[PDB]
């Protein structure tokens, strides 16, 4: 993933990188390389916020003092589905290499919750919600209201692959950000268009004229 | 990924992969460069077997001819939570390196605990994506689920473990990237009580371990 990548254009005009074709993109974003640098150092960033902390003790719970965070009383880490799993299972690696336990419940929302959490004890906890991108903000703003009001952990902070701050209209500010984007829709690396295109190494802007091109229920 | 992993045994007999210990492990199974060099021949593997084939258009339903598999209609692919989640995130990118349009959904099983959202599967080619076959319990109620309730145009299961030493049902997944004696790994998106999910290497846990991380998460 981290070998420099080559942006060019083929000729039919499309955007190619290291020589393959994207008729769907206007423009480069992020490549691979440098998306995955921006990932290594917010592991550490991560790994250096939460390392010393403590929180409350479940894996015995005789214990009344407030325990590190270890295998034992791990992180916790909230992976928002469908848009967060790609960028969750490259994150959770790299905080491996960094030292941080942590485990990983996914719930699945709209942008309302389809499918719930199933940890269920995560009051006085360190908990870190790991989310693809922040547009209008309305969607996590939501989510943390909801974590906070139904859980009451210790702290509640986001993670999100991409910032789109340009397209905010509530007040919502992620603690973490790998990256910031224009104020335009994305696709790749875990961002789509009906599903399609999640599955590319590189984030790009699409062409205004693919944002209706898969209309078809799946 | 791909640079080949040191494996050795620290001051404490406790084994090393890279200068770090993993005190959980017995022995290591496989090692991430090990791992990824299956994953990416198992995706040429996949490529080859659907890249030709033809399913039901629901792109453009006014069309009666099947399709082939493209963007418009793409492999389906069922990821079965949680412990697929980082093998599947790991292959969908070699599949599109090897070109074979595809889309994921999840399932959540542990009984089926949260349903897919995909609902036009019918005619389809499907391609479920697991973690671990052992005694194929899990794998076979799944396949019987899939096939009633989507009537799938064919329906095969890649794993990323098989222990076919414990197979005690009559089902074999299709596709396979590594094989393993009947021993309990972790690692890789293998747990106990969630803990070593996120490692890059899979190991045999020692018995010592697995009764480690008794209380609910
Ligand atoms: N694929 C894609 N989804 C986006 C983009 N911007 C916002 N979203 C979607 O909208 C959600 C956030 O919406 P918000 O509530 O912040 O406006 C994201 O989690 C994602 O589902 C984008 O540029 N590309
Ligand atoms: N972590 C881990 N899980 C296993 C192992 N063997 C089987 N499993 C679990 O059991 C499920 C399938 O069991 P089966 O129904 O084939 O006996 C897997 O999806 C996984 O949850 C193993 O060696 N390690
Ligand atoms: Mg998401
Ligand atoms: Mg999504
Ligand atoms: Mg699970
Ligand atoms: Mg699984």
Same mark, same amino acid.
């Given at each position: ?39 290594? +150092? ?29 295998? +034992? ?25 960094? $030292? ?30 790991? +989310? ?8 996590? *703003? ?14 509640? *902070? ?7 701050? $340009? ?7 992620? +603690? ?43």
């Amino acid at each position: 993933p981290l070998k420099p990548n080559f942006v060019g254009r083929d000729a039919d005009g499309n955007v190619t990188v290291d020589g393959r074709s994207y008729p769907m993109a206007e423009s480069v974003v992020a490549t691979e390389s440098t998306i995955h640098r921006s990932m290594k +150092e917010m592991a550490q960033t991560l790994a250096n916020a939460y390392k010393t902390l403590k929180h409350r003790d479940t894996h015995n719970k005789g214990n009344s003092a407030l325990a590190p965070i270890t295998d +034992e009383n791990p992180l916790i880490i909230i992976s928002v589905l469908k848009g967060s799993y790609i960028f969750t299972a490259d994150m959770v690696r790299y905080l491996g290499d960094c $030292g941080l336990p942590n485990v990983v419940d996914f719930i699945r929302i709209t942008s309302q919750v389809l499918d719930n959490l199933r940890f269920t004890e995560l009051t006085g906890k360190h908990v870190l919600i790991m +989310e693809d991108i922040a547009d209008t903000g309305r969607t996590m *703003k939501l989510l943390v209201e909801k974590i906070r009001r139904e859980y009451r952990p210790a702290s509640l *902070k986001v993670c999100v692959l991409v910032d789109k701050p $340009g397209g905010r209209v509530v007040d919502f500010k992620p +603690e973490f950000v790998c990256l910031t984007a224009p104020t335009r829709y994305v696709v790749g690396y875990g961002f789509e268009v009906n599903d399609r295109y999640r599955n590319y190494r590189h984030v790009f802007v699409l062409k205004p004229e693919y944002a209706k091109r898969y209309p078809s229920k799946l």
